[PDB]
Amino acid sequence: ATDMALALNRYLCTAVLPLLTRCAPLFAGTEHHASLIDSLLHTVYRLS
Numbered sequence: 029a030t031d032m033a034l035a036l037n038r039y040l041c042t043a044v045l046p047l048l049t050r051c052a053p054l055f056a057g058t059e060h061h062a063s064l065i066d067s068l069l070h071t072v073y074r075l076s
Contacts, residue, residue, distance in 0.1 A: 040075070 058065040 037075075 055065070
């Protein structure tokens with residue numbers, strides 16, 4: 029309920045997620061940071 033959380037969500041969904049959607053094809057090979065990309069997916073699904 030904090031407006032800090034609201035502003036953070038606004039920033040993420042305005043800048044970061046569109047940026048990662050436009051740079052999605054570069055996500056082809058991540059076998060060397062598989063743990064990192066798994067953490068990304070887990071955090072994104074938690075936000076969802």
